[PDB]
């Protein structure tokens, strides 16, 4: 048995406020006496065209900002721009508070969405960071400053924060320090992400995975290089391999006795021949966001 | 966008306590002044095999069991036997014991697992209950007494305790009252599973969520009745449909402007043409782990 595993959420659903300007209401992260949210909160319909943010800002006062905490309301006391990030200085600190980072990263690790509406949570789940720094998440109207996060030991590591849905229906947003992961911008245009590619390491982690669950039709006797693995990656729209990856995937690799480049080799196989409607762990078509620490974690089983 | 969803874990994680007896540490959920674990805690090895728990119960002591709750040490004042767990009554109510009660599932429904380690957890994620009465989750060595869970409103609906893996890899588990679900008891013995089935009014919802995601292809201009579908239905392992189940659909009917037996004919050619290498919502096998509460959830916004 192996699912999609989310954190355990609760550090993360006692920082959840609300957040409203006029009729525009998303969420904020109430960390100790600042909330963090979307800065695109202070637009009119209009002016989410383009939006002039610092002009925009300067027409605002504290008690233009509604923040509720569950019952509470929260007093804000000064306003301030970072990037695309508003940071609202409130009078209280959250008693709850957890120990927490801000972190920027990488395309192709995991995070766990809060999906937040009305500064309430309703439910958690696992994104990857896609390699064109888009991440395939489920959010409605109002989702905004729903927050990606991991946990080591005991401390939150803040990752993303929601702004906006692409055209393709994919999401962007920002870290903590609202600087936008990818090109986009704050404003409600047309705006292209890249080709994305699928994430070589994860799909070899998950092929790992399956094998630890007994799962191994897929394996050959055959190995292969970095090289030439590298040549069916780049016709297949896959992340080329490094020595790295291959370095990361070692803890899998000794776990089950399956050297990397043999792994390598049963991809290669999968790519050119198609699955002829088997499944790996339940799925009809390779997936590519489990991290290798992610797979070690659920077949070794971390906790916090 | 459209993903397996888990509920925020928040309130059950300061539930969550680790449960020793012996060499045998699992996880208790300890609510007011009592810890609920699974029985199986005071068997040894041996005792697996035909454990007569009444005798193996009457052996114990408050003090062969070791109770943590983080740093805290909890003692036990009183152990009774409910069915299959053992209630561990504890010096100290749980200052997190959220609003709760205990319900028993129908097979069909879905809830989230906080998959627990040594009392900590470690994981959520959303299961269904089969309709054999397993759970097709992700557990390993001491996950024993992680518990399954709806949130509604302000209250926890505490539905599954795990207790074991089966032959064919899938888990079996009780109500928090300790009756299991199936067929299935606490002993290491071999024990079948039933013949499962496909979960039908699951995967007309999920139908109904990739129409809602704009992701239509299968729909044809046909409809068809209960008795009709019902053929097919038996002849591919599916659940036979009812008039409840299409009053359930209502509202994702109502929604989107189609007939439950208009899906229903989409759903029959599905299953009788396979999916000619297409995906319904990134996904190439039908879904049906999602109940119709969990698509509207998910496509209207529902919080806690």
């Known amino acids: 048995g192996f699912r999609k595993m989310a954190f355990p959420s609760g550090k993360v659903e ?139 030991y005991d401390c939150v590591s803040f990752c993303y924060m929601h702004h906006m849905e692409l055209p393709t229906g994919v999401h962007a947003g920002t ?15 047309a705006q292209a992400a890249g080709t994305d590619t699928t994430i070589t390491v994860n799909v070899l982690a998950w092929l790992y995975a399956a094998v630890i669950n007994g799962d191994r039709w897929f394996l050959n006797r055959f190995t292969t290089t970095l090289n030439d693995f590298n040549l069916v990656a780049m016709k297949y729209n896959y992340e080329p391999l490094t020595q790295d990856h291959v370095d990361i995937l ?22 050119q021949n198609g699955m002829n409607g088997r499944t790996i762990l339940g799925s009809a078509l390779l997936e590519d966001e489990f991290t290798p620490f992610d797979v070690v974690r659920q077949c070794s089983g971390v906790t916090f």
């Open 14 to 152: 006692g920082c959840m406020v609300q957040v409203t300007c006029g009729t525009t209401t998303l969420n904020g992260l109430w960390l100790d006496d600042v909330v963090y949210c979307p800065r695109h909160v202070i637009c009119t319909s209009e002016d989410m065209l383009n939006p002039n943010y610092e002009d925009l800002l300067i027409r605002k006062s504290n008690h233009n900002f509604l923040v509720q905490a569950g019952n509470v309301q929260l007093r804000v006391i000064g306003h301030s721009m970072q990037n695309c990030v508003l940071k609202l200085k409130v009078d209280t600190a959250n008693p709850k508070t957890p120990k927490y980072k801000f972190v920027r990263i990488q395309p192709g690790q995991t995070f766990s969405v809060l999906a937040c509406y009305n500064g309430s949570p309703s439910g958690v789940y696992q994104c990857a960071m896609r390699p064109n720094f888009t991440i395939k998440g489920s959010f409605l109207n109002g989702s905004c400053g729903s927050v990606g996060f991991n946990i080591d």
């Open 250 to 271: 070692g803890p899998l690799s000794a776990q089950t006795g399956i050297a990397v480049l043999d792994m390598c080799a049963s991809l290669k196989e999968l790519l």
């Open 175 to 189: 870290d903590l320090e609202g600087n936008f992961y990818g090109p986009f911008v704050d404003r409600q245009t």
